[PDB]
Amino acid sequence: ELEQQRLDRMNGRTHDALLDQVKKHPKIVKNIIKAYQPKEKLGKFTAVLLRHIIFLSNQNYLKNVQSFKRTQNALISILKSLSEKYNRELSEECRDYINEMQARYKKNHFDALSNGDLVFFSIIGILFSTSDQYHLVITPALILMSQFLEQIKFNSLKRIAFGAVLVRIVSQYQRISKRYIPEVVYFFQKILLTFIVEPLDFENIRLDSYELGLPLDVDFTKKRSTIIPLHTLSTMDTEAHPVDQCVSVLLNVMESLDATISTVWKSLPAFNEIILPIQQLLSAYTSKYSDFEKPRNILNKVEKLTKFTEHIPLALQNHKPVS
């Protein structure tokens, strides 16, 4: 029944500041407060807990996985416990947060952007039905993410990491939807051209800065660094853009592009036409260092997708008589 509902959606305590001050073992206290409340107040407590979780996510991530990720998971579970019983208040809070994020993006380009926006988007995707096509919270969040991906520029490793995190969040939100996104392909092309700017083949891509690059100095072996998702830690340490860090970011971007190609763009033959230059850019990667393994696999997958597709035609527009 839940799967059918998802498919159908696809086809069609008081103050927050006072609660944050009281919290500043916060998860246990929040759970105790929620239990005492459940023994409008529940919705206010849920909104205060969401605000405290957003403040903890966008403030610092200095604690380790077992010290910060466990508390974040406990807070997410406490928020999701009251999310099934309260959905209109949660939708109103999500709409207010989206409006605040839009106002911050309109006021400042990158100064008003925080690291808790990705965590808030992930929490909104996990809590609300991500399979829903027309939703009061999911659709506006996806539109805001597409606007941020198509409007912001890349000039440092922080912008590249934020774009990679946004692309991963869009792929996770469209993991069940499997919708084609030209903004995601444009962001992937811009990330490929920015890391290969160090050029003449792609001149209409309109790269933001040519200072970013990726020299052939990283081995990119099996001992290389993983994705290691920590938005605050990666954004606060992106001023010193290392060769290992940039190589890990490029490998994560290539893996995300391959996952989107084999999971979302594999169902469109015209996307193979949209994969005409980008795989060529991957071929440029094959002409860049000639030692990476992800680019050869991406080229092989693109060749297999082109060979499997017939690239014929598809039309309709028919009619007949009547009763």
Partner 1 sequence: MVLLISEIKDIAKKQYNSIIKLINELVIPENVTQLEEDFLVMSLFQIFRKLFSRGDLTLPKEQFVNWCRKVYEAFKTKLLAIISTSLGLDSLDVYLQLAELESTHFASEKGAPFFPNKTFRKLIIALWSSNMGEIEDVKSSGASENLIIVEFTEKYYTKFADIQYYFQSEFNQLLEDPAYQDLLLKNVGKWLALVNHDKHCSSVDADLEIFVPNPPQAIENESKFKSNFEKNWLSLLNGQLSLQQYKSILLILHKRIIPHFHTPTKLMDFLTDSYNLQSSNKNAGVVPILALNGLFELMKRFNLEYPNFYMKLYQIINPDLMHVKYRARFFRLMDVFLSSTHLSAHLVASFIKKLARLTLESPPSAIVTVIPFIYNLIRKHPNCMIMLHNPAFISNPFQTPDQVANLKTLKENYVDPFDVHESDPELTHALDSSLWELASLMEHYHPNVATLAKIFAQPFKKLSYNMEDFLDWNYDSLLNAESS
Interface contacts to partner 1, rule CB under 8 A: 95, 99, 102, 106, 133-134, 139-140, 142-144, 146-147, 150-151, 174, 179-183, 185-186, 189, 204-206, 268-271, 273-274, 310-317, 319
Q: Which is nearer to partner 1, 133 or 225 (CB)?
A: 133
In angstroms, the CA 101 to CA 270 distance is 34
**Are the CB atoms for 8 and 132 separated by under 8 Å?**
no
Minimum gap (Å) between residue 255 Cβ and partner 1: 22
Minimum CB distance to partner 1 smaller for 240 or for 313: 313
Nearer to partner 1, 61 or 97 (CB): 97
CA angle 154, 287, 291 (to 5 degrees): 95
Residue 7's alpha-carbon distances to 55, 129, 130, 218, in angstroms, are 34, 10, 11, 45
CB of 149 or CB of 230, closer to partner 1: 149
Pull the structure tokens for residue 74.
């406990």
Query: Tokens 């380790």, residue?
Result: 64
- Compute the least distance from the CB of residue 16 to partner 1, in Å: 22
Distance (Å, whole) CA 119 – CA 69:
12
Which are the contacts of 98, defined by CB distance < 8 A and separation ≥ 6?
Answer: 137, 140, 141, 144
Residue 14, Cβ density class (10 Å: 0-12 exposed, 13-18 middle, ≥19 buried): exposed
* Angstrom distance (rounded) from CA 216 to CA 233: 25
Which of 148, 195, 206, 145 has its CA nearest to residue 172? 145
Closer residue to partner 1 in complex, CB, 61/265: 265
Smallest separation (angstroms) from partner 1 to the CB of 229: 23
Considering beta carbons, is residue 229 or 277 the nearer one to partner 1? 277
Closest separation between CB of residue 165 and partner 1, Å? 18
Q: Which of 26/140 has CB closer to partner 1?
A: 140
Of 16 and 208, nearer to partner 1 (C-beta) is 208
Task: Provide the 3-class DSSP secondary structure of residue 180.
Answer: coil
Characterize 249-262 residue by residue with b for buried, 16 or more Cβ atoms within 10 angstroms of its Cβ, and e for exposed. bbbbbbbbbbebbe
Least Å distance, CB 60 to partner 1, is: 30
Please state the closest distance from residue 284 (CB atom) to partner 1, in A.
Answer: 17
Q: How far is the CB of 81 from partner 1 (least distance, A)?
A: 28
Shortest distance (Å) from residue 124 CB to partner 1:
15
